[PDB]
Each structure stands twice: as C-alpha cells, then as structure tokens.
Amino acid sequence: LPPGWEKAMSRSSGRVYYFNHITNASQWERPSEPARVRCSHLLVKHSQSRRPSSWRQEKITRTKEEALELINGYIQKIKSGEEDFESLASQFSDCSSAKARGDLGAFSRGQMQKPFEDASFALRTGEMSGPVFTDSGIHIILRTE
Amino acid sequence: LPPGWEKAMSRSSGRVYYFNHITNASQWERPSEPARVRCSHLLVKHSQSRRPSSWRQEKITRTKEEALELINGYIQKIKSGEEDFESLASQFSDCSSAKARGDLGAFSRGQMQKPFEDASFALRTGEMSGPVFTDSGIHIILRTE
Ligand SMILES: N#Cc1ccc(-c2ccc(-n3cc(C[C@H](NC(=O)C4(c5ccccc5)CC4)C(=O)N[C@H]4C[C@@H](O)C4)nn3)cc2)cc1
Numbered sequence: 001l002p003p004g005w006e007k008a009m010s011r012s013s014g015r016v017y018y019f020n021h022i023t024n025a026s027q028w029e030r031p032s033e034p035a036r037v038r039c040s041h042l043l044v045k046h047s048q049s050r051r052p053s054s055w056r057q058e059k060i061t062r063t064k065e066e067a068l069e070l071i072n073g074y075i076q077k078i079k080s081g082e083e084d085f086e087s088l089a090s091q092f093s094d095c096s097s098a099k100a101r102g103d104l105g106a107f108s109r110g111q112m113q114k115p116f117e118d119a120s121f122a123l124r125t126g127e128m129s130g131p132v133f134t135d136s137g138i139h140i141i142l143r144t145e
Numbered sequence: 146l147p148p149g150w151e152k153a154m155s156r157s158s159g160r161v162y163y164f165n166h167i168t169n170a171s172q173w174e175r176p177s178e179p180a181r182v183r184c185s186h187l188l189v190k191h192s193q194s195r196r197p198s199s200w201r202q203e204k205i206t207r208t209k210e211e212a213l214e215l216i217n218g219y220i221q222k223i224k225s226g227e228e229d230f231e232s233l234a235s236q237f238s239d240c241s242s243a244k245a246r247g248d249l250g251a252f253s254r255g256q257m258q259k260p261f262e263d264a265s266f267a268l269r270t271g272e273m274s275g276p277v278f279t280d281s282g283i284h285i286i287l288r289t290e
C-alpha cells in the first residue's frame with residue numbers, strides 16, 4: 001500500500017512477499033522524508049565500476065552479475081542472522097569506509113549519487129536496502145539514523 | 146619546458162613568468178606518464194553546474210563568475226600561506242571529499258572529466274593547478290602522488 005511497495009508471489013514457492021521499488025528491499029511481512037539520514041554501506045565493485053580498484057584488489061575484474069551474486073549472498077546471511085551487516089562491510093566492502101564498518105556519516109540530498117540517495121532517504125531507521133546500483137558498483141545500505 | 150608549460154612576459158612587472166595551459170598554473174619561477182595519480186581538489190559549484198547541489202547547500206545559486214572569484218581567492222590564500230589547501234578544501238569544497246581534506250584517491254585516465262583528468266596528469270607530485278573548469282564547476286587540484 002505505501003509508496004513504492006509491491007505485493008508479489010515467489011515464482012518458486014508461491015510465498016507472498018513485499019518488494020520496495022525505491023530501496024530494492026524485499027520482506028515477508030506487509031509494510032506499514034527526513035532532512036538528513038546517516039547510512040553505512042557495503043560496496044561490491046565490478047569491472048564496469050567507475051574506479052575498478054579498491055583496498056581488496058588493485059584491479060577488480062568480477063562481472064556486474066558476479067557482484068550481484070555476492071551482494072545477494074550477504075543479504076541472505078544478514079536477513080538469516082548468520083552475519084552482521086557492519087562486520088561484513090568491515091571485511092568485504094570495496095570502500096575506504098570498510099575500516100569504519102561502512103559508515104558514510106550523515107548527509108542531506110545533493111551529496112550522494114542519485115540511486116544511493118533515493119534508496120537511503122526511502123529506508124526506515126534500522127532498515128537495510130536491497131541491491132542498489134550506482135556508477136561505483138552495487139551497494140547494500142543500512143540506514144543508522 | 147615540461148608538458149603544457151610556456152614562458153610569457155608580465156606587462157606590469159617586466160619579468161618573465163611561466164603558465165601551464167592544461168592546469169592554468171602560473172608562477173615567476175621556471176618549473177622542473179604514470180598509470181594512476183592521486184589528487185585532492187576544492188570544488189566550487191555554480192548555478193550552471195551539472196548538479197547545482199552539494200553537502201554545503203541543497204541549491205547552489207552563485208554565478209560562474211562568483212565561483213571563479215572564490216577559487217581565485219582561495220588560490221591567493223594558499224599561495225600567501227594564510228590557509229593550507231587542506232583547510233580550505235575541508236571548509237569550502239562543494240565536493241564531500243571535503244571530509245578527506247579534498248582527497249579523491251588514486252585514479253587512472255577514463256574516470257574523471259577530461260579537463261580535470263588532463264590537469265591532474267599534467268601536474269607533478271606536490272604541484273597545484275590554477276582554476277580548472279568542468280561541467281561540475283571550478284576546481285583547484287593538488288597532486289599528492
Ligand atoms: N576510516 C574511514 C573512512 C574513510 C572514508 C569514508 C567515506 C565517507 C564518505 C564517503 N562519501 C563519498 C561521497 C560522495 C559520492 N560517493 C557516493 O555518492 C556513493 C559511494 C560510492 C563509493 C564509495 C562510497 C560511497 C554513495 C554512492 C559521489 O560519488 N558523489 C557524487 C558527486 C555527485 O553529485 C554524486 N560522499 N561521502 C566516502 C568515504 C568513511 C570512513
């Protein structure tokens with residue numbers, strides 16, 4: 001019902017779930033803007049990233065589809081409680097923020113690349129995005145404030 | 146005569162000076178390609194910028210002429226030693242690289258807009274640009290590596 005949400009059916013299980021077309025998040029439960037938000041992220045870069053390099057690898061060669069598989073694995077592990085978002089960011093994020101558990105600090109509109117901004121402002125506090133595609137790569141976003 | 150450097154005559158002084166038509170650097174003293182360079186910048190946006198918005202201001206309304214006056218003013222404070230480049234970038238850059246004292250990190254050709262890229266690769270390590278004009282606004286570039 002709320003802006004951007006779709007009620008859908010898994011094509012494998014028939015299970016009802018909810019998908020947000022601004023954050024790309026999905027959740028089983030039916031769902032129910034701030035001047036500034038604070039977000040942490042986990043970035044997985046790919047060969048078409050604007051800067052296909054990070055602390056992890058001088059030259060990033062994984063495809064966009066490989067980056068998306070990695071992101072989807074992190075999301076599964078976070079949603080299941082098997083892993084912490086911020087600990088996965090610290091270990092695997094292709095970002096200089098990985099060291100700060102993926103914290104990018106507070107921002108208003110006008111600072112972040114538009115897809116990351118749109119997802120960040122549409123999250124609830126404590127909520128995680130789905131895969132968010134930017135010029136930089138693929139992100140998961142955790143709104144912290 | 147390193148790349149883009151040329152000799153000129155000061156009308157008012159009578160003395161030879163040096164100007165770089167790629168970096169817009171100018172200096173009395175005679176001066177003197179890697180895969181990657183590391184540069185810091187100070188960006189001043191204007192109402193005609195590709196994205197008239199930054200972490201400093203939702204709506205950037207200053208004119209291109211006013212943006213250039215601010216840039217010339219900052220270059221003056223830097224060269225006089227009244228302000229470090231880092232202190233002015235931290236306070237007044239319209240790029241959120243202000244958080245990292247203007248540091249954009251290491252990049253290769255292909256990532257940055259051509260006038261910024263060309264200036265960045267034409268600077269030697271430690272050197273600073275004059276006003277560099279992009280679609281994003283007006284930059285002072287400092288090559289750090
Ligand atoms: N220790 C430590 C430490 C070190 C570094 C950080 C860190 C903190 C903040 C950032 N960051 C980067 C950005 C800007 C940005 N970038 C982005 O818009 C996005 C992004 C892409 C890639 C990496 C990080 C952010 C969101 C999409 C970017 O590409 N912006 C463009 C200019 C145009 O108008 C959109 N803002 N903040 C980057 C790094 C934090 C902690």
Ligand SMILES: N#Cc1ccc(-c2ccc(-n3cc(C[C@H](NC(=O)C4(c5ccccc5)CC4)C(=O)N[C@H]4C[C@@H](O)C4)nn3)cc2)cc1
Binds near residue numbers: 188258259281
């Ligand atoms: N803490 C922290 C922190 C916060 C932010 C950053 C930060 C890091 C990197 C960037 N950045 C922006 C860009 C895009 C680039 N952009 C550009 O080419 C230019 C640019 C404009 C505006 C801002 C920054 C760069 C040089 C002209 C651009 O516009 N490129 C175009 C695509 C076409 O092929 C040329 N790449 N990296 C922006 C911000 C780093 C650290």
